[PDB]
Amino acid sequence: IKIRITLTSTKVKQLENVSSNIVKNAEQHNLVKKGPVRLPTKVLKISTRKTPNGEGSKTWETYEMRIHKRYIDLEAPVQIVKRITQITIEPGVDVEVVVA
C-alpha cells in the first residue's frame, strides 16, 4: 500500500503530539514504519520598516514565520489506513497523505 503521511505546521507541540500519537498507534498495531523524519525548518522572513511615513531613524524590523515539516512512511491495508487518516486531526496542524 506504501503511504506517506506528512505534517506541515508551525505550532510545534501540536505537530509533535500528532506525530507521537500516530507512531504509538502504529507501533501498538505493530506496523512497519520509518521514524518521524524531521525536515529542516524553514524561516520565512519579511523585513520592512517600522515607520509608516519617511522620517525618524532608519529602523528595520524583521518578522519571521517558522514552518516545521515532518513525514513518515507506512504500510497497512485500506480499512485500517482510512481509519488512521480520519483519526489524529489536531487543530493548527495541516496534514496530507500521498501514495507510491
Binding site: S57, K58, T59, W60
Partner: protein
C-alpha cells in the same frame, strides 16, 4: 572487520570528516594525497601535526578525509583538526592511554587549535550599517 574510527574538524563553515583505519601508511584528502592541498604554504601548516609527532605514528594506518564549506584556508584548518583528532581517537580506541596522552600533550602544547575548535562564531549584521558594528555615516549639514 577492521580497527577504524571516524572523526572530524570544524571551522567557520568548513567540516572535514576523516576516516582512519589500519592500512599501509597513506594519507588522502578528497581522494588526493596530503601533498596536494594547494594553498602551498598552508600545506606546511597542515603537515605540522605529523611533523611534530613524526611519521612513525602513521606507519600502518590509512587516513582519508573529505571536506566542505568555506574558504581554502578554513578548509585547511578543518583538515588539520580532523587528522589530529582522528589520530588521537585511534590511540584512544586501540593503543594505550600513555601514547595517546603524550601525543595529545604534544599537540596541545604546540597549539590548542588542533583539538579544540575556534569558537569565534560570526556575529550577524544589524541595520544601520554595512556590518555588525560599523554604522554608515552621520551627516549634519
Amino acid at each position: 572487520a577492521v580497527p577504524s574510527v571516524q572523526t572530524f574538524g570544524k571551522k567557520k563553515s568548513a567540516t572535514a570528516v576523516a576516516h582512519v583505519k589500519a592500512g599501509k601508511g597513506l594519507i588522502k584528502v578528497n581522494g588526493s594525497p596530503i601533498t596536494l592541498v594547494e594553498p602551498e604554504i598552508l600545506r606546511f601548516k597542515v603537515y605540522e601535526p605529523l611533523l611534530l609527532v613524526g611519521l612513525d605514528k602513521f606507519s600502518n594506518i590509512d587516513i582519508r578525509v573529505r571536506v566542505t564549506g568555506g574558504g581554502h584556508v578554513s578548509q585547511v584548518y578543518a583538515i588539520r583538526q580532523a587528522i589530529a583528532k582522528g589520530l588521537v581517537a585511534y590511540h584512544q580506541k586501540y593503543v594505550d592511554e600513555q601514547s595517546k596522552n603524550e601525543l595529545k600533550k604534544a599537540f596541545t602544547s604546540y597549539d590548542r587549535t588542533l583539538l579544540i575548535a575556534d569558537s569565534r562564531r560570526p556575529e550577524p549584521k544589524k541595520f544601520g550599517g554595512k556590518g555588525a558594528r560599523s554604522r554608515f555615516q552621520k551627516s549634519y549639514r
